[PDB]
Design a binder for this molecule. Structure first.
Ligand SMILES: [Mg+2]
Ligand SMILES: [Mg+2]
Ligand SMILES: [Mg+2]
Ligand SMILES: [Mg+2]
Ligand SMILES: [Mg+2]
Ligand SMILES: [Mg+2]
Ligand SMILES: [Mg+2]
Ligand SMILES: [Mg+2]
Ligand SMILES: [Mg+2]
Ligand SMILES: [Mg+2]
Ligand SMILES: [Mg+2]
Ligand SMILES: [Mg+2]
Ligand SMILES: [Mg+2]
Ligand SMILES: [Mg+2]
Ligand SMILES: [Mg+2]
Ligand SMILES: [Mg+2]
Ligand SMILES: [Mg+2]
Ligand SMILES: [Mg+2]
Ligand SMILES: [Mg+2]
Ligand SMILES: [Mg+2]
Ligand SMILES: [Mg+2]
Ligand SMILES: [Mg+2]
Ligand SMILES: [Mg+2]
Ligand SMILES: [Mg+2]
Ligand SMILES: [Mg+2]
Ligand SMILES: [Mg+2]
Ligand SMILES: [Mg+2]
Ligand SMILES: [Mg+2]
Ligand SMILES: [Mg+2]
Ligand SMILES: [Mg+2]
Ligand SMILES: [Mg+2]
Ligand SMILES: [Mg+2]
Ligand SMILES: [Mg+2]
Ligand SMILES: [Mg+2]
Ligand SMILES: [Mg+2]
Ligand SMILES: [Mg+2]
Ligand SMILES: [Mg+2]
Ligand SMILES: [Mg+2]
Ligand SMILES: [Mg+2]
Ligand SMILES: [Mg+2]
Ligand SMILES: [Mg+2]
Ligand SMILES: [Mg+2]
Ligand SMILES: [Mg+2]
Ligand SMILES: [Mg+2]
Ligand SMILES: [Mg+2]
Ligand SMILES: [Mg+2]
Ligand SMILES: [Mg+2]
Ligand SMILES: [Mg+2]
Ligand SMILES: [Mg+2]
Ligand SMILES: [Mg+2]
Ligand SMILES: [Mg+2]
Ligand SMILES: [Mg+2]
Ligand SMILES: [Mg+2]
Ligand SMILES: [Mg+2]
Ligand SMILES: [Zn+2]
Lengths: 105, 59, 134, 104, 135, 50, 24, 86, 122
RNA sequence: CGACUCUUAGCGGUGGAUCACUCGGCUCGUGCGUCGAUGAAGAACGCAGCUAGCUGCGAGAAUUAAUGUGAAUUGCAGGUUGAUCAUCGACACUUCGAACGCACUUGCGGCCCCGGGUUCCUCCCGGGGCUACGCCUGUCUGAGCGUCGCU
RNA sequence: AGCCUUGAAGCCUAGGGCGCGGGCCCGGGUGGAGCCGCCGCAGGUGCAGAUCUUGGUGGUAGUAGCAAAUAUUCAAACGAGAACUUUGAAGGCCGAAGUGGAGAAGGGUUCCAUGUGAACAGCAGUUGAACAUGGGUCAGUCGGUCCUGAGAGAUGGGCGA
RNA sequence: GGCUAAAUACCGGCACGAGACCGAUAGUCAACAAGUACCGUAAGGGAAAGUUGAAAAGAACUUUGAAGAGAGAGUUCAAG
RNA sequence: CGCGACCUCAGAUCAGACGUGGCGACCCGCUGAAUUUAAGCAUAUUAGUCAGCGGAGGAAAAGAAACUAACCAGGAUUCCCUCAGUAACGGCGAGUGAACAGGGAAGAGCCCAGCGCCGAAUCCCCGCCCCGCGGCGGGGCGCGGGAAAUGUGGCGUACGGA
């Protein structure tokens, strides 16, 4: 029974939602757990960087976002061929390599 | 005697013959409502039941 | 405060660990401080009491300067029984009055090999702590 | 309060008849709890009204500029003489209320 | 096909669910063959299976079963993943090819309803409230 | 039933030993919370199930 | 012992009794 | 005569003491247990009987083997090692 | 005397059987004394006799089973009681060398391209 | 002032309301994340000097061995070369139970090896080890007017 | 720089009061261990009703009732206590399809002895099928065990996610 | 045709820590000999039940009654 | 008819192993409604839901495109914010309802069949010796027994390979 004036609305509570309620009280403990896992990885690899291998300068698709530049998945095989680095040497010296990428530009 | 419930009449006969050094005429068994097996061991008349009872201590 | 996240600061859990402790923890809890002379002599602050120890009563109705031998240590009720600390029941028999070992001082110890080992270990730990404080 | 508190008991209402108050009661039994009344907030045992949920909005967030304004006001009131005594601190013998001490 | 295990008609409900004859079972008969072979032999582990012949009243499948406990499989490192206890009864969970064809999993726009772990994981990830701390 | 079986006779033999009351020294202990035997099964009142 | 249960309903004043029947 | 006079004819028994679950739920005519399903190889449990779950679970009975499995687990399952004698 | 557990291991097995039979006779005598009506000394002694029989049987079982496992130590096949009783999922694992068995191509890749140790500058 | 009835107060009985105590629940978070034919979960039956219930244990039966602890348990009697406790890594774990020799009456078997019986001469008794279905590799014995080679 | 074993909370009060009112402060008794005033904050926050849920207690009320199947009387003993226990005598009933002697299902220590009158036997008991200590079930020949009936139920096979 | 840790989930279990929660008609059904007593043939249903005192110091002894029960006397600061 | 192989199929209390069953909070695969809403009710909704069945793990599943995009193109799987209560579905009624992309936690890649080269260069079991034997392995010695040419192992797999 709607009253005088208000927005029309569709609340999605017709299902049994109270059984599946993802409580987020794990959140600061998970932040501490990620912090300890990252410090454990940084103490595991002692001279290596804590973040990881390097990631490519990447233009974005989908014309809303193509002005921004990301850090991509890995370098291309033609990129490593022009640089003169073998693809099994690059993964061992700490360079991200993926074979699915292309070089149009 | 009072006997474990898993026994046989031959087991009671050989057990009395071994641990009392006496011959057994027959063995009559019953299981009491307490749970254990009451055993009436009828002996041979060459030995005396009162004498072997005084020998094993019961009176 | 406490900085160890495993040490219990909960009342019901502490009372549970107290009143449901096994006997080797009962003996460790039921300990009594030594006197000034024995403390200066052995450099030991406190010791668990034994059946064959001498006791002056410090607090209570039966306090004073009487040195009595322990009758026996009854760890179920967390109590000891002292020889001359007793009272008369109505029928006439004497029953030893229950004294908790926290209100108990030791005038003389009964020394065995394990007893001397405990006193030497406590004196060694006290000297190590004094060296760390120095 | 847990959701299983009270609803573990099975209780069908007797309905009309039997001069009873139309309450879901325990289905039979030769035991103190037989035709007693399980469900409902008003019955003995069972569940209370409005079980407090785990997904209550416990945490309230504050704007960062309001937090910094609260810090600035709490520090600026620690310089005035009357606002410190109105908190209750005995400060009669303190030589200066902005008490700045050396780096030792 | 699979008909509904009920008496004569008598499916008590709305007129949507009175269909009994023209119901179709969700998994394939090759996966039915795999799960029947895996139920007959719990020690053997299903690798995959294939078709050899069909009749009007029957089909015929060769199911490949592997010993996870024989030494020739155990000491070979290419197949010792079969010896791991994670892959016990692949035929029931649908880890072989005939089971994975029935799950409807894949990449892209044609497989939106099984994103995540499976269809059940997709439905459970979609139908939950994320009631945060600070909301 | 005079024609008993061994399983039923042993089940009755355990209940006959459980039917006995408490002794008098058991309520002299320190941490006692037992005044009387609350599991006294009478042969007319409780019919042992079955 | 046995806790005497709730007194069994005795279907009396209903329709099958011709002792008490009002206006029909 | 469906009540008191009909209760007098009840002398023969259908159920009896079972030998896997222990409860008196073993039918003699169908030769099956109504509590746990004794001719069935599996333990008859259900999710609608949520109260009858916790009457018979792992935490109810003796656990004569599971507690020493936990005891060997809390020190990582050592076998054959002996402590240093005096 | 107090039958301790240390001196029972060094003695001969027939002496252990003779002491066990003497303890069984003495336990039967204490049961007869209990039923006829005896002393509380015997009523407390029967528990010590039971624990001494438990100790003698424990020492006999140790001298039997350690000698049996010393006998079956050198062989490849050994009985199920002498096999190490741990959990079933841990017994049904892979072997320690079989966890380390790698393929020839994986050994070739681990030889040719190992994970190098490196660092970067600021 | 009588008896009975009504109101208030002091006190005394049915009653356990309020208050204060809490070896217990509820909720949240962390680590570990392990059952079983080498017999699981569960159940039954026994085990204390006096022991019904709970707890613990399995005919070695409110515990055995080893380590640490270092003068007790205690309701009552009884008796430092280690009592009692905790850890438990060695030993052991009755009967049903996936339960497994077939059925569930605790009945009836079969094979082999030991001791009474013998003087291997077959019964009888006692003890020990096997005997559940399916399936994997190999061995043995096989069947096929299935495919063949030789006489 | 609150109160408190030189007496906290709760409770009772034929006392002094205050506020329109919700209610609150002292005086007296009981009690023995925690409690409150102010500024903010949060809630499982205020009972006269629900044929309200639980527990307890009144009038009815010392009332209805202890009325199916012919019946008891006297003396003695135990005992503190006798109509109900025991014995002796008299008179009766069940009147051999029994109110007798024995079985099956079912009950499971109810069978027996000794002691008790704390609790039950809708009165009472010296009595009991109650309580507490103790005892009691002896098989080649009596039954199960062996066999099959109506049936149940494995193996092969088929079906079934 | 097939394998693969990581970040992800946990109202079962073991060891734990905390609470602007509950304070015995509340909180799990269960703070205690609780899935126990008891009911139903069966699947199943399923309770009520904490507070002597600091220490049993649990009232010796006299006296009426057979005893249940009292009256003196005694313990405890307090048997109110 | 006899002898000897191969191929199918038996019998074993044969030697060596395995599976059965429990818990089930999380995870996977099936089967799967009606209460309720639509102020009735029949498509819808509750809802791939409660219940039922089977299966392991400490996590499971998924996982390195027969991908998303149409841009100056991004590039395994999983989880969070946003896209979004939007596109879309629906007696277009009640209501149901994603995906891409971006910002982050994490980030690890690969192996066969086929095609082809190598004297089967391959694997299992039993006998002896040495080491270690409570996760039964490494090496040597056997005209020992088998598996396998109806194909075992090494190079090699979409990123090219020989
Ligand atoms: Mg309006
Ligand atoms: Mg409005
Ligand atoms: Mg510390
Ligand atoms: Mg409640
Ligand atoms: Mg519909
Ligand atoms: Mg397809
Ligand atoms: Mg009756
Ligand atoms: Mg019947
Ligand atoms: Mg199941
Ligand atoms: Mg290869
Ligand atoms: Mg008044
Ligand atoms: Mg109460
Ligand atoms: Mg007992
Ligand atoms: Mg020992
Ligand atoms: Mg020791
Ligand atoms: Mg039979
Ligand atoms: Mg107090
Ligand atoms: Mg509150
Ligand atoms: Mg009221
Ligand atoms: Mg009258
Ligand atoms: Mg008769
Ligand atoms: Mg008769
Ligand atoms: Mg009476
Ligand atoms: Mg009698
Ligand atoms: Mg005869
Ligand atoms: Mg059938
Ligand atoms: Mg592919
Ligand atoms: Mg693929
Ligand atoms: Mg996979
Ligand atoms: Mg904290
Ligand atoms: Mg209560
Ligand atoms: Mg209460
Ligand atoms: Mg309660
Ligand atoms: Mg209260
Ligand atoms: Mg009280
Ligand atoms: Mg109270
Ligand atoms: Mg007082
Ligand atoms: Mg075999
Ligand atoms: Mg409607
Ligand atoms: Mg409506
Ligand atoms: Mg309608
Ligand atoms: Mg749907
Ligand atoms: Mg379900
Ligand atoms: Mg399973
Ligand atoms: Mg596991
Ligand atoms: Mg996986
Ligand atoms: Mg993506
Ligand atoms: Mg929006
Ligand atoms: Mg329309
Ligand atoms: Mg939908
Ligand atoms: Mg994306
Ligand atoms: Mg990152
Ligand atoms: Mg090849
Ligand atoms: Mg690829
Ligand atoms: Zn059963």
């Amino acid at each position: 029974a709607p009253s005088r004036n208000g927005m029309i609305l569709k609340p999605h509570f017709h299902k049994d939602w109270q059984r599946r309620v993802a409580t987020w009280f794990n959140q600061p403990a998970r932040k501490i757990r990620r912090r300890k896992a990252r410090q454990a990885r940084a103490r595991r690899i002692a001279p290596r960087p804590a973040a990881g291998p390097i990631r490519p300068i990447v233009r974005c698709p989908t014309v809303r976002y193509h002005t921004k530049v990301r850090a991509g998945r890995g370098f291309s095989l033609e990129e490593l061929r022009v640089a003169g680095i073998h693809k099994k040497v690059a993964r061992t010296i700490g360079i991200s390599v993926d074979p699915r990428r292309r070089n149009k530009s | 005697f009072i006997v474990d419930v898993k026994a046989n009449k031959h087991q009671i006969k050989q057990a009395v013959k071994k641990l009392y050094d006496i011959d057994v005429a027959k063995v009559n068994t019953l299981i009491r409502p307490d749970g254990e097996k009451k055993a009436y061991v009828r002996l041979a008349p060459d030995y005396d039941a009162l004498d072997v009872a005084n020998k094993i201590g019961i009176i | 405060m406490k900085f160890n996240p495993f040490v219990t600061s909960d009342r019901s859990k502490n009372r549970k660990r107290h009143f449901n402790a096994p006997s080797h923890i009962r003996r460790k809890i039921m300990s009594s401080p030594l006197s000034k002379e024995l403390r200066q002599k052995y450099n030991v602050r406190s010791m668990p009491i034994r059946k064959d120890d001498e006791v002056q009563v410090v607090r209570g109705h039966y306090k004073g300067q009487q040195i009595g031998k322990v009758v026996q240590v009854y760890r179920k009720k967390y109590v000891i029984y002292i020889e001359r600390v007793q009272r008369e029941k109505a029928n006439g028999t004497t029953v030893h009055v229950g004294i908790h070992p926290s209100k108990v001082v030791i005038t003389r110890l009964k020394l065995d090999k394990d007893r001397k080992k405990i006193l030497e270990r406590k004196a060694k730990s006290r000297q190590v702590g004094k060296e760390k404080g120095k | 309060v847990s959701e299983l508190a009270g609803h573990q008991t099975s209780a069908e209402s007797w309905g009309t008849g039997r001069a009873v108050a139309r309450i879901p009661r325990v289905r039979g039994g030769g035991t103190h709890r037989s035709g007693q009344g399980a469900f409902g907030n008003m019955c003995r045992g069972g569940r209370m009204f409005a079980p407090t949920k785990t997904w209550r909005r416990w945490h309230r967030r504050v704007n960062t500029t309001q937090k910094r304004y609260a810090i600035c006001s709490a520090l600026a009131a620690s310089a005035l003489p009357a606002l410190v005594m109105s908190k209750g601190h005995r400060i009669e013998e303190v030589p200066e209320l902005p008490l700045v001490v050396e780096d030792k | 096909g699979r008909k509904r295990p009920v008496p004569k008609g008598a499916t008590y409900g709305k007129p949507v669910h009175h269909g009994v004859n023209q119901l179709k079972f969700a998994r394939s008969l090759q996966s039915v063959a795999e799960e029947r072979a895996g139920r007959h032999c719990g020690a053997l582990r299903v690798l995959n299976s294939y078709w050899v012949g069909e009749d009007s009243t029957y089909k015929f499948f060769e199911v490949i079963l592997i010993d996870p406990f024989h030494k020739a499989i155990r000491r070979n490192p290419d197949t010792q993943w079969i010896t791991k206890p994670v892959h016990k009864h692949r035929e029931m969970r649908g880890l072989t090819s005939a089971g994975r064809k029935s799950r409807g999993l894949g990449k892209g726009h044609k497989f939106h309803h099984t994103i995540g772990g499976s269809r059940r994981a997709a439905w459970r990830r979609r139908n939950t409230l994320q009631l945060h701390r600070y909301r | 039933s005079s024609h008993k079986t061994f399983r039923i006779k042993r089940f009755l033999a355990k209940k006959q030993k459980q039917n006995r009351p408490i002794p008098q020294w058991i309520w002299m202990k320190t941490g006692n919370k037992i005044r009387y035997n609350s599991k006294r099964r009478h042969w007319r009142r409780t019919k042992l199930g079955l | 012992d046995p806790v005497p249960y709730q007194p069994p309903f005795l279907c009396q004043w209903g329709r099958h009794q011709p002792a008490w029947k009002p206006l029909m | 005569t469906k009540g008191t006079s009909s209760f007098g004819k009840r002398r023969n028994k259908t159920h009896t003491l079972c030998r896997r679950c222990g409860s008196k739920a073993y039918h003699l005519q169908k030769s099956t247990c109504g509590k746990c399903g004794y001719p069935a190889k599996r333990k008859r449990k259900y999710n609608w009987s949520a109260k009858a779950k916790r009457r018979n679970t792992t935490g109810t009975g003796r656990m004569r083997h599971l507690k020493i499995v936990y005891r060997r687990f809390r020190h990582g399952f050592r076998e054959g090692t002996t402590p240093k004698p005096k | 005397a107090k039958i301790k557990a240390r001196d029972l291991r060094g003695k001969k097995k027939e002496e252990l059987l003779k002491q066990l039979d003497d303890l069984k006779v003495e336990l039967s005598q204490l049961r007869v004394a209990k039923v006829t009506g005896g002393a509380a000394s015997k009523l407390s002694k029967i528990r010590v006799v039971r624990k001494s029989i438990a100790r003698v049987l424990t020492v006999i079982n140790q001298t039997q089973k350690e000698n049996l496992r010393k006998f079956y130590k050198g062989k490849k096949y050994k009985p199920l009681d002498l096999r190490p009783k741990k959990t079933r999922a841990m017994r049904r694992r892979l072997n320690k060398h079989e966890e380390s068995l790698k393929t020839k191509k994986q050994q070739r890749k681990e030889r040719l391209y190992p994970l190098r140790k490196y660092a970067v500058k600021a």
